[PDB]
């Protein structure tokens, strides 16, 4: 069972380079606006550093073409540079905010040049295990690109932190050089179950047993092994996989609890339990 | 350290749909030629004992329906080269990237753009397994590729699913990788082995981590005698030479890293970490 990223072509055509003084990073060019991390203009005072800036302080490059900046503005932690040319490659798109445990693709870029694409999950501690600042994360739904993430900073443990495209941070982080750390992370329980349903669909059934559990008894077992608590909405989202396979969610929870205590001695050719597929990803 | 796929845009603009009779799969549209698996001319029954010469001589250009998104492309010639069909169309693909065709060796990595009926669905990073199969994920005609300096090197086209769930296919000149054929025979992927040179390249990548090093070395022969007991591919002098650069930047001799690998296979990771020894990053990949 392979992790798959969305085809990145629609996003590739939007990546540009943004330079303010000696700082260069990636920007996202949609119609006649380029979006990028506001710290490109850098205990900072952003409203003051931006008032001191003029359009001529920004250099925007789309491949060979220099784009002329004709207005600048800030929205939370994202800088919005109005430019002289509308991106003729602008896809149908929306700005969305995702929740911990949801997945998306990141197009990693260096100085406006796309480098590679990978599938991510937003960890429960709101970080991502992933010159890349300004790279964006996204899902694609029938020609429409839903941008959900922009990369702002690396945390000392090596994970990544960023904002939605409206500039709102994911997690308790700020765009300053102060000391910050990811909280203790947790495993995304609903995604592990979705992945177990994927195993059954792929004909791997050895971890199934005759037992069922209670939502409360599993959650006491899940909290002990550092798993996110499972909710009734989690049971409802797993519904379609419980109908296709005939294994009820609390039946699958029984299986997971037994795996968390005895090991696999094996499941989709994996050793650990994979938690970066959502219920939606598995159906797809 | 993520397994990253190449940005897929340059290949997305080349994917089309090819239909012959009731069979539809993916094709690759480069200049005025569409490449697809020749078994597009087979009707499942034919797959048991297909005679491609006889099946193809009976087709005319208008039997092949080629669609590039909305536009139907007019086929004006056709030709078979080994196991790929080459359909000459009336229009050269305006989105053709700089490209070339290359045949790869087991252990080499590449990205696959998985497609259904001509429309890209997802992209993933791959290695050609030593048994010449792909542990990948209607997808016939999807292609594998590397991109170096805006040039797309096409190295794989998907043709067959094997009974164990893995995939077999050809280069873009239609020559199968491994002993597989585009016929529904009892054919199966032989026991697969770990790509040793890639594991070692990854260990060099690990080295600000060095908990797994030890004070031992090994001969090449002793390493291979041990590693083959874990179903690891034999390590050659070519492989030793390939890892030379990574051996320098880290200061760890290749056979010293081999000794570390021997101990990791003996011990495991003792709850530390991936909890797996990873073999789908090449020495070239690691440096990049």
Swiss-Prot record, chain B:
Effect recorded for residue 88 to R: In strain: Beta/B.1.351
Residue intervals of the Peptidase C30 domain: 1-288
Catalyzed chemical reaction(s): TSAVLQ-|-SGFRK-NH2 and SGVTFQ-|-GKFKK the two peptides corresponding to the two self-cleavage sites of the SARS 3C-like proteinase are the two most reactive peptide substrates. The enzyme exhibits a strong preference for substrates containing Gln at P1 position and Leu at P2 position
Effect of residue 130 to H: In strain: Omicron/BA.1, Omicron/BA.2, Omicron/BA.2.12.1, Omicron/BA.2.75, Omicron/BA.4, Omicron/BA.5, Omicron/BQ.1.1, Omicron/XBB.1.5, Omicron/EG.5.1
Signal peptide: none
Location in chain, cross-link Glycyl lysine isopeptide (Lys-Gly) (interchain with G-Cter in ubiquitin): 3, 88
Catalytic residues of the enzyme: 39, 140
Subcellular location(s) of the protein: Host cytoplasm; Host Golgi apparatus; Host nucleus
Cytoplasmic side: 1-288
Regulation: Inhibited by pyridone-containing alpha-ketoamides compounds 13a and 13b. In turn, alpha-ketoamide 13b (tert-butyl (1-((S)-1-(((S)-4-(benzylamino)-3,4-dioxo-1-((S)-2-oxopyrrolidin-3-yl)butan-2-yl)amino)-3-cyclopropyl-1-oxopropan-2-yl)-2-oxo-1,2-dihydropyridin-3-yl)carbamate) inhibits SARS-CoV-2 replication in human lung cells. Inhibited ex vivo by michael acceptor inhibitor N3. Inhibited ex vivo by compound 11a and 11b.
Entry coiled-coil feature ranges: none
Top-rank taxon, per record: Viruses
Its job: Cleaves the C-terminus of replicase polyprotein at 11 sites. Recognizes substrates containing the core sequence [ILMVF]-Q-|-[SGACN]. Cleaves and inactivates human TRMT1, preventing tRNA guanine(26)-dimethylation of tRNAs. May cleave human NLRP1 in lung epithelial cells, thereby activating the NLRP1 inflammasome pathway. May cleave human GSDMD, triggering alternative GSDME-mediated epithelial cell death upon activation of the NLRP1 inflammasome, which may enhance the release interleukins 1B, 6, 16 and 18. Also able to bind an ADP-ribose-1''-phosphate (ADRP).
Complex formation: 3CL-PRO exists as monomer and homodimer. Only the homodimer shows catalytic activity. Interacts with host FBXO22; this interaction promotes the proteasomal degradation of nsp5.
Protein name listed in UniProt: 3C-like proteinase nsp5
Primary gene name: rep
């Amino acid at each position: 069972f392979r992790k798959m990223a969305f085809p990145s072509g629609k996003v590739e055509g939007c990546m540009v380079q943004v330079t303010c003084g000696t700082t260069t990073l990636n920007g996202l060019w949609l119609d006649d606006v380029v979006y990028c991390p506001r710290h490109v203009i850098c205990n900072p005072n952003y409203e003051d550093l931006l008032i001191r800036k003029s359009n001529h302080n920004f250099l925007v490059q789309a491949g060979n073409v220099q784009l002329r900046v004709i207005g600048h503005s800030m929205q939370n932690c994202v800088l919005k540079l109005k430019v002289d040319t509308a991106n003729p490659k602008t896809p149908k798109y929306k700005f969305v905010r995702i929740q911990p445990g949801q997945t998306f693709s990141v197009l990693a870029c260096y100085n406006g040049s796309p480098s590679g694409v990978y599938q991510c999950a937003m960890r429960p501690n709101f970080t991502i295990k992933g010159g890349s600042c300004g790279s964006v994360g996204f899902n694609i739904d029938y020609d429409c690109v839903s941008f959900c993430y922009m990369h702002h900073m690396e945390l000392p443990t090596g994970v990544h932190a960023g904002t939605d495209l409206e500039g709102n941070f994911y997690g308790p982080f700020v765009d300053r050089q102060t000391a910050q750390a990811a909280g203790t992370d947790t495993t995304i329980t609903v995604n592990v179950l979705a992945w177990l349903y994927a195993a059954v669909i792929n004909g791997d059934r050895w971890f199934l047993n005759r037992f069922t559990t209670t939502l409360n008894d599993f959650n006491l077992v899940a909290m002990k092994y550092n798993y996110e608590p499972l909710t009734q909405d989690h049971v409802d989202i797993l519904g379609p996989l419980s109908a296709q396979t005939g294994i009820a969610v609390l039946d699958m929870c029984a299986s997971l609890k037994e795996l968390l205590q005895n090991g696999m001695n094996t499941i989709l050719g994996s050793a650990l339990l994979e938690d970066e597929f959502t219920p939606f990803d598995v159906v797809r």
